[PDB]
């Protein structure tokens, strides 16, 4: 908790630019992909 | 044997797509449907639906009235002394020019 919490939060948001572009270039709906991945990850899947 | 009022609302909903109105179509579709129904079915005219390009205000603040407005005109000294609200006034029209 502190002033650097928002900086680390935006650091995590900007790091997901790669898979957002793969869904954009492939014609897929990106947000879907990013959120799905984020979750399939909550079930213990390290690689998705 | 459906109702006639709902027919105009149903077909006008398609026209309000691909515009800035499609979310505010619930309120403005009633305006044009009630506006065209006031016209005569035999003689439907395109010049009686004039819309004035008045600035200011949000589009949802508009109001539909069966009457007609005109925009105040030149107004020689005399204006802002008469009552600006009447109960049952009588409207007169004159190609008459009343000047000395």
């Amino acid at each position: 908790e502190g002033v650097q919490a928002f900086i680390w939060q935006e650091f995590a948001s900007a790091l997901e630019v790669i898979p957002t572009t793969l869904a954009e270039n492939a014609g897929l709906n990106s947000i879907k992909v990013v959120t799905e991945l984020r979750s399939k990850h909550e079930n213990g899947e390290l690689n998705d | 044997k459906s109702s006639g009022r709902e027919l105009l609302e149903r077909c006008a909903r398609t026209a309000m797509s691909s515009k800035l109105i499609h979310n505010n179509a619930d309120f403005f579709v009633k305006m044009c449907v009630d506006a065209v129904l006031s016209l005569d079915r035999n003689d439907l005219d395109d010049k009686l639906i004039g819309i004035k390009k008045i600035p200011g205000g949000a589009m949802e603040e508009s109001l539909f009235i069966n009457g007609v407005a005109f925009k105040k005109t030149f107004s020689y000294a005399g204006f802002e002394q008469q009552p600006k609200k009447f109960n049952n006034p009588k409207i007169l029209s004159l190609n008459v020019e009343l000047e000395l």
Binding site: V3, F6 | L20, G57, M59, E60, E61
Partner: protein, 121 residues
Amino acid sequence: VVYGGGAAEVTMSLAVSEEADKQRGIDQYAFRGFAQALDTIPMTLAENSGLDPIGTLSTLKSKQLKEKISNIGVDCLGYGSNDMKELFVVDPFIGKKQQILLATQLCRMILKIDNVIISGK
């Protein structure tokens, strides 16, 4: 009448955030953009008044979520109390409403433009 000065904006903001949570899909992210867009006004008042936007924005979001009283905003003159009942500030409802209506109705027109042709004079 209403009570502006970030108060209105902060209120509106938490409202939108809760509703945003009750919304799932492309829509939620939007609602979130509308929430963060309303926060720029009290952050601008905090920026011009010199106060910290972190402590100011965090205090309004945390306090307004706890208490239901919705007349606390950004104190720019440097008073010790942020409650606007004592500071003598009042705004109209028709004035604060038109900021959102004319803004959200214009930006629909700004976003629809794809082809932009400018004839040089």
